[PDB]
Design a binder for this molecule. Structure first.
Ligand SMILES: O=c1[nH]c(=O)c2ncn([C@@H]3O[C@H](CO)[C@@H](O)[C@H]3O)c2[nH]1
Ligand SMILES: O=c1[nH]c(=O)c2ncn([C@@H]3O[C@H](CO)[C@@H](O)[C@H]3O)c2[nH]1
Ligand SMILES: O=c1[nH]c(=O)c2ncn([C@@H]3O[C@H](CO)[C@@H](O)[C@H]3O)c2[nH]1
Ligand SMILES: O=c1[nH]c(=O)c2ncn([C@@H]3O[C@H](CO)[C@@H](O)[C@H]3O)c2[nH]1
Lengths: 167, 169, 176, 170
């Protein structure tokens, strides 16, 4: 495609496999995943299942503004911050900066996709991409802004959307 | 060498800050208590000005370390950070920095006591002091961290501490 | 995936900048070369326009996996007074545009008469368009003066004289 | 009241002692001093001797807004930096210096001036005293006398004789 990258769940799985394999190759097995809410939710859960990482914590950030930090002490822990895309890099910057104030043993970052203009390059990523990424978990947000985007099941979504608006 | 405020002096420190907040027309929407030294000051200030929303940040101080941040969204709120003493000023700096990341409408700071060398001056404080302060709520910590500390009820404390050490895991 | 300019093209890029400078009636009193990618462009531009005053700024923008910060870092500024001078900042590529932005910001504190910027190549996503540039390019550029860094850091890099480079790199390892 | 504050060298030493004591108590021992040239020259050297700080670097800046002429330093990355000047009047100079030094990505930049005026836009992190009138320092007293020869400083007669010889040979 030319404007959009619309990864299948199959590709999302392979992105996570790719980051997992790179973590193992680097010998960086995090003690704690910090999922960036809410784009990093699904990548962090899949990565957790893949590598059997039992400790996931969360930071609610909107873009960046912190709304909440859901974690206990990280002192002396190896942390991996997980997001779905690093576009401007501002989110990873803000999250790295605040997590560093918890004095972890180490902070590394991971994002499934990287834009070529990001001010922060994740330690781990699957693909650098210069198109707008429509993820399986924000496809309806994208459709609500632009109905033309070429995603599956749009008809069923649009029927539901119309019923919602009637409320 | 020590300044050892009575609880009566602590009450007057809180009144002074509450009076300053009202004079300045800065009535915060949210108090952020610096744990654990800011606990008592924040509760007393909250009681005094009927400030119903208190949130908390667990920070310990060669650098301040954040252990947890106990708060919901602060966006668009007027926040007042509350601690008991600003000494190096590193704690207020660290807390102000992280709270600013929550995009509050405003952040101001308060400490009961200020040391004259602090790297961060609070917006509100009661007294500038150059002695080490023994607070009523950390007097036993000061006893445990020093050789010979002149506080009331020390002999009752030491008898209890002796028994605590005898049975500790 | 790479744009790999010949030295012939680099010369033409510098000509193109010099031609644009003259067309804009902006003949710099001082070139500020961004070290170290702007070194060779600034020297060639100086020879072309007979600009005798080149000064330097050591600035890096770490954007690698493992070596990453959000902003460029100045290490040193090699210049004396620029007050009242027309300055041109010269670099080889503007990618994010942060480097040109940072250098412009610091040079402005020297109260020049004017600061303008030039880069041989511009990426489509730069935050600001340099005042002068040769071409907008979206491929990763391999310059003649950082081709061996690219070879050391990336796989399957197709550059001329790679044979001679790897032979030397082999010898370097034996004494490193 | 008095027109000028005219500190003795004894007072300048005490100002430097005061700042040095505050640096130690506040847990900020600098890795590098950045002396603002040329008023911060003598304060920085005295502070360096007091605290045994071996790394002094320099910035040539003059003050509509401050103008940097040169920055005499190598990499400051990861270092604790203290900027040192003699007086903060508008605060524009410390603002400009802090701004450029921050671009060197130090671990931290803090500022110090011996004296602070109340209308400064920037309050230095460390200072000795607040003053709300003109200060004549031991190191710029002759510049002041050249503007107004009535200012009450010592050794003025010797200076004026020298100054008269200088005015000739031009
Ligand atoms: O679905 C997205 N695809 C992208 O390529 C992309 N690039 C940037 N963003 C933004 O990331 C922020 C995360 O907090 C959101 O505001 C998105 O607009 C993106 N969202
Ligand atoms: O009891 C204290 N007295 C002080 O003067 C003082 N200055 C700094 N501190 C630190 O502040 C914490 C409580 O807010 C203490 O545990 C000290 O680390 C002080 N604690
Ligand atoms: O060889 C490069 N090609 C590029 O397309 C490119 N885009 C950005 N950079 C950065 O600019 C410096 C040289 O001025 C390099 O060291 C990269 O950090 C590039 N380097
Ligand atoms: O001797 C000075 N006394 C002042 O009160 C004062 N206020 C501002 N300045 C400026 O600071 C420079 C020395 O650091 C002087 O040359 C004045 O420009 C002052 N210089």
């Amino acid at each position: 495609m030319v404007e959009y990258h619309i990864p299948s769940w199959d590709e999302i799985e392979d992105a996570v496999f790719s980051i997992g394999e790179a973590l193992v190759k680097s010998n960086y097995i995090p003690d704690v995943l910090i999922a960036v809410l809410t784009g990093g939710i699904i990548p962090a859960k899949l990565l957790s299942d893949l590598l059997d990482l039992k400790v996931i914590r969360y930071i609610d950030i909107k873009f960046p503004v912190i709304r909440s930090v859901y974690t206990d002490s990280l002192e002396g822990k190896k942390v991996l911050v997980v997001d779905d895309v690093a576009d401007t890099g501002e989110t990873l910057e803000a999250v790295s900066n605040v997590i560093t104030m918890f004095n972890p043993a180490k902070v590394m970052t991971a994002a499934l996709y990287l834009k070529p203009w990001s001010k922060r390059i994740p330690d781990f990523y699957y693909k650098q991409i210069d198109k707008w990424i429509i993820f399986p978990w924000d496809k309806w947000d994208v459709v609500r802004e632009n109905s033309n985007v070429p995603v599956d099941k749009k008809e069923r979504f649009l029927n539901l959307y119309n019923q919602l608006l009637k409320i």
